[PDB]
Design a protein around this nucleic acid. Sequence first.
RNA 1: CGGUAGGGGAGCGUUCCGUGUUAGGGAGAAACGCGUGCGUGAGCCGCGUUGGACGAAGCGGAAGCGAGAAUGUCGGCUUG
RNA 2: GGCCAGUGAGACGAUGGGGGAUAAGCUUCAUCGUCGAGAGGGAAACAGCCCGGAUCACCAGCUAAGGCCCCUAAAUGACC
RNA 3: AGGGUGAAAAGAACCCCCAUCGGGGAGUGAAAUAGAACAUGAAACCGUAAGCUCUCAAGCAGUGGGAGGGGGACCAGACCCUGACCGCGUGCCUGUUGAAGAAUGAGCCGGCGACUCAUAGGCAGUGGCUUGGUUAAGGGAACCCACCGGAGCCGUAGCGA
RNA 4: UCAAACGAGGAAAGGCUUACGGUGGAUACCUAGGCACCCAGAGACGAGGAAGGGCGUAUUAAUCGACGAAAUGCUUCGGG
Lengths: 46, 48, 144, 115, 162, 28, 124
Amino acid sequence: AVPKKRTSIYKKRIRKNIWKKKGYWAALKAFSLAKSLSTGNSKSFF
Amino acid sequence: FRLDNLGPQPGSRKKGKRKGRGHAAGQGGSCGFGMRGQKSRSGPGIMR
Amino acid sequence: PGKCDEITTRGYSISMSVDKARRVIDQIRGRSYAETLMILELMPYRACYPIFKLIYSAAANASHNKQFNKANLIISKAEVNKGITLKKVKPRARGRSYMIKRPTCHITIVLRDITHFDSYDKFLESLTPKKLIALLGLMSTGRR
Amino acid sequence: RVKRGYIARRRRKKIRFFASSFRGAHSRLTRTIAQQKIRALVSAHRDRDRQKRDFRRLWITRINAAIRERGVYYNYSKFIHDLYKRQLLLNRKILAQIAILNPNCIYMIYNEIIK
Amino acid sequence: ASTLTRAEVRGGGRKPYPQKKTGRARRGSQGSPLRPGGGVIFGPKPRDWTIKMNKKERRLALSTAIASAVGNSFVVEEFAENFEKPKTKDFIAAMQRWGLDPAEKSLFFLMDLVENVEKSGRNIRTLKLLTPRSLNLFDVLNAEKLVFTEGTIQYLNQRYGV
Amino acid sequence: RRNIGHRQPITRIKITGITGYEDYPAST
Amino acid sequence: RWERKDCKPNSLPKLHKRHVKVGDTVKVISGGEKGKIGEISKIHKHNSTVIIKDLNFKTKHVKSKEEGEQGQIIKIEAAIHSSNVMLILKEQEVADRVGHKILEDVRKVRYLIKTGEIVDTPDR
RNA sequence: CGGUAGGGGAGCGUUCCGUGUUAGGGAGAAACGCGUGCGUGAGCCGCGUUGGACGAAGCGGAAGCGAGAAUGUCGGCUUG
RNA sequence: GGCCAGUGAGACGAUGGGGGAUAAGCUUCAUCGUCGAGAGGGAAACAGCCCGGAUCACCAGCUAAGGCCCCUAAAUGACC
RNA sequence: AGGGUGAAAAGAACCCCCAUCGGGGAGUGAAAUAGAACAUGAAACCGUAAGCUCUCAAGCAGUGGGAGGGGGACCAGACCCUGACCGCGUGCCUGUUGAAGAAUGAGCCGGCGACUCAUAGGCAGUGGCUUGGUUAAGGGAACCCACCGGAGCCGUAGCGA
RNA sequence: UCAAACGAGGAAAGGCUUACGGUGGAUACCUAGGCACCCAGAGACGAGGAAGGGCGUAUUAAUCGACGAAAUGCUUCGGG
C-alpha cells in the first residue's frame, strides 16, 4: 500500500495532463450548450 | 625591507595538515586512524 | 514586446488551487473573447468564475486602457503560476498532526488584438531596411 | 568567526553545467549530478580505449568485405599473406578507407598484390 | 572573540524524545551543535597567549631594518627643533624643505621628546613621533622616508655597535 | 578518484604539392 | 519602521543640537536643490531635518473627502537635512557658517563668521 | 610512474588582518549568471539590456577554512 | 637506529597433512599464486582459474592466453 | 519564529473592470519589471513560448561513432542544440574474505554540521647567540612594546642502595 | 491502369536545450542588536516600605516606557 519510491517529472506530467485533457473534453460540450443557448427555439432553459 | 617584500624561508613554517577534508589531501575519511578500535574513538583512549 | 500589441493583466493570489485553475485556463487558450465569454458563462467549475472575472476585467481593460474591440481579440498565453500556500496544522487520531496547505494561484493573462497591415503580395525586396523595420511587425519564418 | 561561503555553489555549478542532456533528474538533481559527472568520465575512458579497439574491428571487417567481392576464394588472411610477402610496410588498415573512397585504387592495390 | 559551546547555552539538558520507537535520529539535546539553535564545536575561546621572541634576535631585527633603511636614499637627517608657538606650519614647512611629502607616510623620532613637536606632529596622519622609550619595528619598517637626529644616530650607534 | 587532464601537443600542417613520383606505374 | 523610530533615554526622545532657528534665511548647500535662498517653516529636531519654503516640491496625492469628491493634488514640501543649509544676510549675499558671539550684555547671539552682522532677531 | 588501511612532499580556494584611506569602482565593486580561453586539478582570467557600493593582485599571517552521506539538523518544495 | 602509522575477522586454487564420512564455497595448519589493494583480454554472464601488470594521448602496428559459420573480429583453410 | 521600498511616502489625484481583494492606464520617483507579500533573488519546485525528436519499445538512462534536421555565423572544414541505430557500461558512501546487491544510509534543494584550544615532554625543519643560552613574575607614554628584572631552567661528572 | 518493394513528409502527451515568469530566501552589502577583553568604579537597595509585579494616570483606541489619587507629573537651587 505504501509507495516504494516516487514518480518522475515524466510520469507526473503525463498523468496530470491526462487529468487536464479530461478537463478539456468537457467544454466543447459546454461550447455546444452555450451555442444552443443562443437565439433559437429550444424547449429548455426557462 | 618594506612591509610588502618580507617572506619566510622555505622549510621554516610547514602547513598544519587538516584531517577529514578529502581523500586527495591525504588524511580524509577516517582521518588516519584505520577503521575501529580505541585508536579511532574519541577520548583519553589508552594509558601509555 | 511585439511593438505594442498585447495587454498583460496580473492577478491576486486568489483562494483556490493552482491545478484546477490550470485545466480551466488551459481550456480557454487560443480562443477569442466571444468564445471564452460564452464558455466561461457555462463551464461547470468553481475555478471558472475568477478566470471569467479576469478575462472580463482584462478585455474591458483592453478597451479602456487601449481602444480596441471585444471581437478581434484572442487570448495570447494565459499563464497561471503558484502563489503563497498557507499551512494548517490539523490534528488526526493516534496523536498525529497533518499539514493541510491552503493553496493560492497567481494568474497572468495576456490578450492580443490583430493590428495588421495585410500586405498585398509576398515578393521580397532587399532594399531600404529602415522601411523593412516598420513594414514587418509580426510575421513567421524569419530568414537571415 | 563565522565562515558562511559560496564556493560549494561554483564547485557545484560547474558540475551542474557539465551535466546537460542527461534526461531528467540526472540533469537537474545535484546528488545525482555528481555521480553522472563521475560515471560520464569513466564512460569516456573505456569508450576511448574501445574506440581504438572498435575502429580496428570496423576496418578489419570492412576490408574483409571489400576483398571477398572477388568471388574466388581469396580471404582476408591471404591478402595479408601476399601483403607482407610483397614488401608493403604497414598500410595501417587505411586501405579499408581508400577501399571505399577509391575502389579502383584498391583494385590496383589488390591487382598488384596478385602479380 | 568568544562563542558559546554546548555546555553554556540555555538549551535543554534533557532527553527530548526516547531512544527508540520513532523514525528519527538519536538527538539527545536541543542545544546540540548539529542543530542550529545553539552550541558550537571547536570555536574560538578568548585566548591571551604569550608568543615570546628572543631579545638578541629582535635587536638584530631592528638593526637589520634600520641597516637596510639607509643607503638607498631613504634617510635624510635632521638635528634640532626649537618651536616657539607650536602651530604645524613651520613643521610642515620644514617637512617640505627637508624633502619629505606630508602624505607619503614618513616616520621620524627625536631624543627627550620636547613637547612642542609632539604638539605639532600628532595631527598629521602619515607620521607619528617616536623615541627610544617607544621605538618599535612595525612603525619604522614602513621605510619610505625616515630621519634621525644626532642623539639618535649616536645613541643608535651607541647601542647597536660593531 | 583522480581528475587529471591531457592537452596533446599537436601540430597543424598545410600541404603544398606532391612530387618525385614518376617511377613504376601500375594502372589497371 | 522600528529601525527608524526615535531613541528614548528614560522615555524622552533624544533631541539633537543644531544651528538653524525659525525665521532664518538658509541656503541649500549641496544636495539636489543647490543654490537657492529661503525661509524655514516647521522644524524637526529629532531627524535634524528642516522644511524650507517654496523650494522642495513633493507633489502628493490625497484622497480628500469621505464622499469621494475632488481628490485634490497638493504640492507639499519635504524635509531637507540641517547640515545641507547655511545662513544668509541680505546685505552680503554669501552663504556663511555660524558663530556664538558673547556681547556686552549677558546674552549670547549667533554670528556669520565671515561678515560682521548678527543672525539673532529681537522679540518681534 | 595500478593501488585499499596508511606515510611523506607540493599547491588551489574561502573570510579577516599588515601593506591599505592599495590599484580599481554609479563611465558599475561584491553578488548572480555566462564561456569556441588557460591549468595535473583544486581554480584563474574574460564577457553579461540582471544588480547597485565596495574592494583586487603581489609579498605574508590566522582560522567556527572547503559537504554527498551521520534513521544528521533547520527552512523551502516535491511524490503518493 | 630516530620520528611515526595502520594491521592483528582473511578468501579461494595447487601440493603436504590432521578433524569429517580423504563430504562440504567445511575447519585448522606448512610452502606458493591471485584477490584483498588489480584495471584489461579470455572464461556467455561471474573476486581468487589462464594470459597479463593500466602515467597519458593516437580513427597507429605486432602478439600472450584464447579463437577464425552467423549473432560477434579473424579460415564454410589444407591433409590424415 | 518572523530584519532591510525609497534619498525623501514624494504610499498612486483622476478614468475603467468592480461587492471587495486585486489589475491596467495616468501621476511621483533616477528606478513602479523599488508598489507596500515592496532592497540583490540562487537551487529544489511549478509553469508558458521557440528548435529537434519519441507511440514494435527492454533501459543506473551515460559514453564512443553519428543518420536526418535546426541556429547563428568567419578563420565558411569550425561552434552549439536534437538524436535513426550499433558496440560497451552491475548507482554513490559505509564496510566486509566478498556489496549492482534483495546489507546500511539518504525524498529533494540551500544553509548549519566534526582531530580544535590551553600547558607541558619528545623529535623534525628554519632561525638568534656560542665572550654558554634564555628569562618568568613584575615595572612600562591605558594594552602590545623599547629597556630593565640572572630569580630560576638546561648543558657543563660520573659510579654506588 | 494493375501488381510488387520501401516507409519517408507533416503528425500527440512528453524528453533535451534555450528564453521569460511565479513560490523560495542561499549568496553579496549592511544594521536597528549582541559577545569578549583592558582601564577605573560599583556590587549600593529595604519598615523613611525594597527588587519584582497588579491596577491606573494624557483631550480622544490598544501596546511599551515614565509616573502613582500630588499619577504621561510636583518644589527648590544651578546649566541652557
